Design a protein around this ligand. Structure first.
Ligand SMILES: Cc1c(C)n(Cc2ccc(C(C)(C)C(=O)O)cc2)c2ccc(C(=O)N[C@H](C)c3cccc(C4CC4)c3)cc12
Length: 270
């Protein structure tokens, strides 16, 4: 429909959330895609396609701590070290969402608990194509087929992430669309264990309308793209369930997981 004063607010909200999306996250989908196509002035990332290429990229790494079994551990421990840094960047973006910090602190924890994994899955699509995924803030690129070649419990922990990304990146969403799409996931008013739901649903419905207005403007072709995104929010919860069910098996009937003190030692040291 036509414009008005309310449309001026949703476009300003979309820009405000976009400004926070650029600052909260260092590698946006715009630059992440520019690295994959080689059309960026930055150096080409190191490619990990076989076991031999992996034993050359680790020589560029500073540390050296964990045999064909230590590979599946170091690789898994790697994204675990980015997942902990992910929450740092996701929380800063969540705090920048207008009205999130005014919620109850117990709800802010509950929204971030069940929602951070879906954002990790969502933003992971911005870093990967049909061949591999960008790792270490665009410094490396690990092949999808190489992640399949890992040991049996670890050859299937990245594949659900690639299958969702191929269907998700087929929508050609940009940083402006993904900015509003993440906030809607954060402000999911039906997270198990919320205190005040009404103030959260007001923000989500406000973010939903700012998202639908964004998609109608930023995507003239392909109607019902807003309905396609809402189905992806339902797909993520099914994928996170299969991921958290697989993560508890590798952390209890496989690895030791990383020690709590060692993780903070590696964070502040390098
Ligand atoms: C498997 C893997 C993925 C898939 N990546 C991409 C990735 C991007 C972005 C995200 C988030 C969630 C932040 C996102 O933006 O969506 C997640 C995963 C990686 C990024 C870096 C590394 C990694 O080993 N680094 C260094 C070398 C490192 C740092 C500390 C400790 C160690 C080893 C214990 C000694 C290694 C691994 C991976």
């Amino acid at each position: 429909h036509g414009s008005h004063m309310e449309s001026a607010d949703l476009r300003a909200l979309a820009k405000h959330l976009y400004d926070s999306y650029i600052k909260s996250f260092p590698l946006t989908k715009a630059k992440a895609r520019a690295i994959l196509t080689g059309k960026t002035t930055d150096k080409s990332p190191f490619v990990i396609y076989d076991m031999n290429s992996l034993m050359m990229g680790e020589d560029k790494i500073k540390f050296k701590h964990i045999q064909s079994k230590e590979v599946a551990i170091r690789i898994f421990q790697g994204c675990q070290f980015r997942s902990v840094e992910a929450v740092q960047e996701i929380t800063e973006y969540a705090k920048s969402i207008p009205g999130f910090v005014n919620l109850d602190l117990n709800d802010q924890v509950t929204l971030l608990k069940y929602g951070v994994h879906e954002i990790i899955y969502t933003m992971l699509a911005s870093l990967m194509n049909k061949d591999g995924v960008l790792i270490s803030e665009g410094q490396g690129f690990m092949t999808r087929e190489f992640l399949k070649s890992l040991r049996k419990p670890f050859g299937d922990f990245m594949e659900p992430k690639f299958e969702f990304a191929v269907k998700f990146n087929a929508l050609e969403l940009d940083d402006s669309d993904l900015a509003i799409f993440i906030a809607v996931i954060i402000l999911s008013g039906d997270r198990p264990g919320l205190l005040n739901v009404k103030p959260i649903e007001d923000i989500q419905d406000n973010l939903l309308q700012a998202l639908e207005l964004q998609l109608k403007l930023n995507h003239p072709e392909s109607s019902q793209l807003f309905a396609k995104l809402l189905q992806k929010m339902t797909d993520l919860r099914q994928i996170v369930t299969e991921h958290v069910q697989l993560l508890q098996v590798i952390k209890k009937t496989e690895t030791d997981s990383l020690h709590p003190l060692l993780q903070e030692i590696y964070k502040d040291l390098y």
